[PDB]
Amino acid sequence: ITMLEDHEFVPLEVYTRHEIKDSGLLDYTEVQRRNQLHDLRFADIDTVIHA
Amino acid sequence: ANFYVCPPPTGATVVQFEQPRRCPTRPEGQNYTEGIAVVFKENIAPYKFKAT
């Protein structure tokens, strides 16, 4: 008679939530972030010209 | 709380002990082949590259 040896079940999953989220071609959050930061980056949103 | 009377037995009924039964044998066991392995999964991740 021999004891059943202890076993450690390491965490394991075929696809993590991060890669599941990244599976989609376009993510609305990042796309909108880039599109709405486009004005702030490639243009001045504070300088005012009056003449 | 019971009592019994056993008459002197005759040769009418004869009994025998069972012969030693053939003990079952251990299975040969799962013939295991060791070796390295690399499990592959379907590439759901897109093909990313830098574009300008």
Swiss-Prot record, chain A:
Q: How is it modified after translation?
A: The cytoplasmic tail is phosphorylated by the viral kinase US3. Phosphorylation may be linked to a down-regulation of gB expression on cell surface.
Where in or outside the cell it occurs: the entry states: Virion membrane; Host cell membrane; Host endosome membrane; Host Golgi apparatus membrane
Quaternary arrangement and interactors, per the entry? Homotrimer; disulfide-linked. Interacts with host receptor MYH9/NMMHC-IIA. Interacts with host receptor MYH10/NMMHC-IIB. Binds to heparan sulfate proteoglycans. Interacts with gH/gL heterodimer. Interacts with the host coreceptor PILRA.
The family line of this record is: Belongs to the herpesviridae glycoprotein B family.
Q: What does this protein do?
A: Envelope glycoprotein that forms spikes at the surface of virion envelope and binds to the host cell entry receptors MYH9/NMMHC-IIA and MYH10/NMMHC-IIB, promoting the virus entry into host cells. Essential for the initial attachment to heparan sulfate moieties of the host cell surface proteoglycans. Involved in fusion of viral and cellular membranes leading to virus entry into the host cell: following initial binding to its host cell entry receptors, membrane fusion is mediated by the fusion machinery composed at least of gB and the heterodimer gH/gL.
**The protein's name:** Envelope glycoprotein B
Gene that specifies this protein = gB
